Structure formats: structure tokens, C-alpha cells
Amino acid sequence: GSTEFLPGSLIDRAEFEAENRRVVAEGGEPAAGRPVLMGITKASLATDS
């Protein structure tokens, strides 16, 4: 919608819920998301550093 996200990506739950609460509080749009399961190499190669 209007949450500044690319549909198909993998984002953290904390950031996702923070963005969903921030956006609806001012403009209003809920993004969609289903839980996912990853490996131990894709979780290690997708860190924030």
C-alpha cells in the first residue's frame, strides 16, 4: 500500500508492527504479512551489519 515496502521482501516483526502502527495513526493503511520459516544460512546472511 503506502508503507514504503517492496511486496515480497522479508522484514523483522518489530519493524513491521512499528510501521503498521505508525502509518495507520497518521495516514492509514495496513500492510499484509504472513509468518515465514528460514534456514540458518539465510538468517545469518540477512543481518543488519
Please report, for the chain, how many H helices and E strands are present, in that order.
1, 0
Rounded to 5 degrees, what are φ and ψ at 19?
Answer: -65, -40
DSSP 3-state percent helix, strand, coil across the chain (nearest 5):
30, 0, 70
Cα distance between residue 34 and residue 21, in whole Å: 17
Residue closest to 33 by CA, chosen among 2, 4, 7, 23 = 7
Quick check: 29 and 1 in contact, CB under 8 A? yes
* Residues contacting residue 23 through CB under 8 Å, at least 6 positions apart: 2, 3, 29, 30, 31
- Secondary structure (3-state) at 27: coil
Q: Which resolution in angstroms does this entry have?
A: 3.2
Cα distance between residue 40 and residue 21, in whole Å: 30
* Residues contacting residue 16 through CB under 8 Å, at least 6 positions apart: 31, 33
Q: How was this structure determined?
A: cryo-EM
